[PDB]
Assembly symmetry: C2
Homo-oligomer: 38 residues x 2
């Protein structure tokens, strides 16, 4: 887990969690509103 | 979506899509594997 200039950087981590969280989160929501908003 | 700096970098983009793609993808799967594989 290097600082920078490598295949791993702070922006890379925060980026993955950003799309992974908002991605799955929003996905679940829409799925619930689809036809099971209980 | 600049090449560097500006709080936006190549690694940041690929990172978001990485967790976003695998995030929702894996999510939807488990949802169908739970008890509704139709």
């Amino acid at each position: 887990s290097p600082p920078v200039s490598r295949g791993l950087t702070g922006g890379e981590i925060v980026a993955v969690i950003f799309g992974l969280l908002l991605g799955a989160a929003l996905l679940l929501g829409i799925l619930v509103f689809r036809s099971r908003r209980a």
